[PDB]
Amino acid sequence: HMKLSLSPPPYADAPVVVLISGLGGSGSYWLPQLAVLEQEYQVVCYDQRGTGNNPDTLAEDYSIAQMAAELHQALVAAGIEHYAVVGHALGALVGMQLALDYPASVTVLISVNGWLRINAHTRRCFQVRERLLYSGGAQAWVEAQPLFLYPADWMAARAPRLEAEDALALAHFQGKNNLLRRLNALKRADFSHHADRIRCPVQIICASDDLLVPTACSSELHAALPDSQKMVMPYGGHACNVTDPETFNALLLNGLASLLHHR
């Protein structure tokens, strides 16, 4: 079913790296990582089901299990049976789910500002953001969204870009139904008792100034996982790969190479 964006391999049989975005679901989230990653890997990006170019009306029972299954089956269908996963936030949860359900496929896993189970803090954030959704629709959602993603100074020095992104986010808004189904799936994901079984090498990347997910979630992940390394960026926010790609990209390239080689 699901459309995937496969980059050209830089050389024969380059290892595959699948990039999994967070709640916005969009493959284009990873734009500032694509050039460096395509230099070494066959990169896969995609829009998650119910978002972007994979529109759908998501069902009531929609789960992270299903999200993993959808991506994994699309990959197998594209001829990809072994792959690395780099996941952002919700995308890290899908990555963990893939490492649990398809351990013969997932080579290594990178979690960017992910978590074992949703923190009270992140719930509080989503309670505020749901309130905006219900009272002010897509416009109010999009208005608040970057305040959870980017540092203030980063955003404030980039008004023309924020304006263009705010217009894009509203025009490509995934809709109330799918957002609420995906949020539900997000909140219910709980890997705290399954982290043992995630046996592939794992890199945990987080930013100290992430407003949406406290880095204590990454510390929790790191304590629970059998084979993980944790790197903390001092700044950059939840969307730390967007705001400081120079630091992020160096952690990602070294991390991927390290994890594939300890495997």
Add this chain to the structure above:
Amino acid sequence: GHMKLSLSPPPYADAPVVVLISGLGGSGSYWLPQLAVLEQEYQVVCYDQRGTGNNPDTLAEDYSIAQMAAELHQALVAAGIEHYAVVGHALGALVGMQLALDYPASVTVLISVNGWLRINAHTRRCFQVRERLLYSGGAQAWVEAQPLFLYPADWMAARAPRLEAEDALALAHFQGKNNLLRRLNALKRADFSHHADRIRCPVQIICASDDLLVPTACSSELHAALPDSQKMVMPYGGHACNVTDPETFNALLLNGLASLLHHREAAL
């Protein structure tokens, strides 16, 4: 006078006075983690802003920062305080600037904590979000969102029981829709960008790199525009950086007040 002020005892005869001016929540208790260190060297004044806390009132439609300064200033003169330092947080920093403009013979030195010259588009965006919550969900939804704009995530996440108790206090003391909206209007309209020349007293600018509500670019703007300022940037602590990392904040504040009062001795 009607406006209640909380005066600490002076530590010695004719100790310089330092007036602490809180941000939008208006509450003198905001400064609790600074009081012990400050009272050792200064006569400290704290207060609840009119329309908030223990100075309740229904604020009128034309309410402005000019009026806020007038209210605090008159209360100070009435308590026998004619020369005083101002430490202001956010909106409080704007009141402090206003006081430096309207009562230059009184304000000895000014410290701006995560203040600004005029409201940034980013801060407007933040307040627009928060206004939506106010209008759609009342005090409960306002208070629910509030700490997200004040504190780092990790600081908050490690302190759920404290946040819960502060949220209940904030709800029971909620300044009310009318006053909040009047004070926000006042806040947004304050514009010192053409008046910075007139702020002639020594100034310290303190900010936090991780302030979500006011980007530190505002403090950089203040620093470029003021005739006599120093700027210190804390690496972490958020908008409420005196609450979250008082050990760093207090050191900057105590050293700042001493440095500024020495500048003033040379400028006198």
